[PDB]
Design a protein around this nucleic acid. Sequence first.
DNA 1: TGCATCCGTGAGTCGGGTAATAACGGCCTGTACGCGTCCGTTTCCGGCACCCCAAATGAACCGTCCCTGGCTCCAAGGTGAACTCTGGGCGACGAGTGTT
Length: 88
Amino acid sequence: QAITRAMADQARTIRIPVHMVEVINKLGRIQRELLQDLGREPTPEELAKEMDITPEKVLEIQQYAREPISLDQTIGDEGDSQLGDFIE
DNA sequence: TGCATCCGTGAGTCGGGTAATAACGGCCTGTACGCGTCCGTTTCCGGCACCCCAAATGAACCGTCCCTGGCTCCAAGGTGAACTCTGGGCGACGAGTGTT
């Protein structure tokens, strides 16, 4: 319990409430189970059927789950300049 | 007391974006939203107290911008004659020519 609560409260650059992290992890887990079972990836409507909630909220959860990237990671094929040198 | 052993700077110039996990009820509250009701406002229907206001309805009316009246005093239309061409009419004279 302590480890999972701390993961939810501290693992992400943008804090996500545990009530939303739980649904994100559950969605990912059962979606990978569905992919393994069915042989293809599950579509958002199919995943919403298991979430017992609407595909709009499924998509909102999906776009919420994304994490930021570093402004200083090298973007070029070689190491020449940082991503921060491309942002207006 | 060297002595290996890290250990800390290079090394120039103007195509984009790639992922994981057991987690699950149950209670609280909190800020935002959703109901029902009541009161200040405000905005007009038609009323005056009358405010009167006024363009439209009778005058003159006098100067003036139109009519009628007569009068000229002149310059244009009517009345002459000639003449210098303008044109036709008259006449004579001369060689190229119809003919046996």
